[PDB]
């Protein structure tokens, strides 16, 4: 299906959720530096 | 877009569907649009002649229902009708089938009302497009 | 997370989701953004399913509009950027409006920026499509202080409206560097935009009195002026403002409108 050709593209297998491959360079960075909306979880529907 | 779409109408002769839309009384659950995008998700899936059935109907009914509808507890009353007595706790592998579906016709959902409305210019005799809610 | 580019020299980011079944409000941000393809707003480039995780992928910018709001107080933000931002935001707004999407919720951390003096809307989470006709509509919507009036109060098949009186209330955010109506809670909110806009009534609106969560028990404030309230401001942009912001929905400026506002004379890309 689709997530083995994300994979390819991604260069991740999503796997462990920070494994790398090549073609991108992966990081992992601290969230404080990001701006909220990336590490920001869903919401509740109540 | 195509000028088959006569195995999709086989399912409205069926009786657990028929007495579904009888159980819908302001076409809450089931719009005449929300039946036209339920054809619309089963042109974008590809399906085949097998392939369409209760499940599969349901299943992408449920999902227009979850993106064009703001009420977010009267699409819940379709699980007993697909599920049978128990849903209860037989709903969740229910929705990871809307997933599945969802994952299936490249994740766009969403229809545009004349594209609703050009599907439904077939055969407008057809008596699902003469029912809709109002107020 | 996060990522890299080595190649074409882009940067995107992870967004990692993940218990019986999706949420509904996923569903509506990803099938919403893979319909959207503008320079203006944030893009969706793919998403995955596996198991137990969903991931998105999504394009980086560097910073939201509060942290870069928060980055001067003590200073401003010069009015070329103010225009540059705000038209902008407009824009893509108008790609937004203009097909089958309402956005419902926008917020200074909706908003994304970059370096290269950009912005993008974010979180289409409570976003939805207007087009198919007669649907359902809860009236708890965007958050907190950038609500408008008519949902403010009872209003049903509210319209694309909902989403300008919000970026004006950013619009002010932008310029006074702090938050035009600091409501505590609903109600009370309300009394806020009676005490800076002035208290309505059936001149300005046809059908306030017919809301229902309305009751002539409310105190009866003027309109402040736009000297007062927002100084920094130009005549230009007091004349944006002022219809950009207004009780009746059906008078609001629309997006296509504001582009072609004489506040817009001097629009540039720093």
């Known amino acids: ?46 | 877009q195509r000028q088959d779409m006569t195995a999709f109408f086989k399912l409205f002769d069926d009786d657990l569907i028929q007495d579904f839309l009888w159980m819908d009384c302001c076409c809450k659950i089931a719009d005449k649009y929300l039946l036209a995008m339920t054809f619309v998700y089963f042109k974008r899936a590809k399906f085949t002649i097998s392939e369409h059935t209760r499940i599969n109907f349901f299943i992408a009914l449920y999902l227009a229902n979850t993106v064009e509808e703001d009420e977010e507890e009267t699409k819940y009353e379709i699980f007993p009708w697909a599920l049978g007595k128990n849903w209860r706790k037989l709903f969740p592998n229910f929705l990871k089938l809307r997933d599945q579906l969802w994952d299936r016709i490249d994740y766009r959902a969403i229809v545009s009302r004349r594209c609703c409305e050009e599907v439904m210019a077939i055969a407008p005799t057809h008596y699902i497009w003469q029912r809709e809610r109002s107020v | ?270």
């Open chain 1, 1 to 46: 299906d689709m997530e083995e050709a994300s994979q390819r593209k991604w260069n991740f297998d999503f796997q462990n959720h920070k494994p790398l491959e090549g073609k991108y360079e992966w990081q992992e960075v601290e969230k404080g530096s990001l701006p909220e909306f990336y590490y920001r979880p869903p919401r509740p529907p109540k």
């Open chain 3, 1 to 270: 997370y996060k990522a890299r580019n080595k190649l074409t020299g882009e940067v995107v980011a992870l967004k990692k989701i993940r218990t019986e079944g999706v949420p509904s409000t996923a569903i509506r941000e990803i099938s919403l953004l893979k319909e959207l393809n503008h320079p203006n707003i944030v893009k969706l480039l793919d998403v995955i399913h596996t198991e137990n995780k969903l991931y998105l992928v999504f394009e980086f910018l560097h910073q939201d509009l509060k942290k870069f709001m928060d980055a001067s107080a003590l200073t401003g933000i010069p009015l070329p950027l103010i225009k540059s931002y705000l038209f902008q935001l407009l824009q893509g707004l108008a790609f937004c409006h203009s097909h089958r999407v309402l956005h419902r919720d926008l917020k200074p951390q909706n908003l994304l920026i970059n370096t290269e003096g950009a912005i993008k809307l974010a979180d289409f989470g409570l976003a939805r499509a207007f087009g198919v006709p007669v649907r359902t509509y809860t009236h708890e919507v965007v958050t907190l202080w950038y609500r408008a009036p008519e949902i403010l109060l009872g209003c049903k098949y509210y319209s694309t409206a909902v989403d300008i009186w919000s970026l004006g209330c950013i619009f002010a955010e932008m310029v006074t560097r702090r938050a035009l109506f600091p409501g505590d809670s609903e109600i009370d909110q309300l009394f806020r935009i009676f005490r800076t806009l002035g208290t309505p009534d059936e001149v300005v609106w046809p059908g306030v009195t017919s809301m229902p969560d309305y009751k002539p028990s409310f105190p009866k404030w003027a309109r402040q002026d736009f000297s007062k309230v927002v100084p920094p401001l130009d005549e230009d942009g007091r004349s944006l403002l002022s219809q950009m912001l207004h009780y009746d929905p059906n008078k609001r400026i629309s997006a296509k409108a504001a582009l072609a506002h004489p506040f817009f004379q001097d629009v540039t890309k720093p």
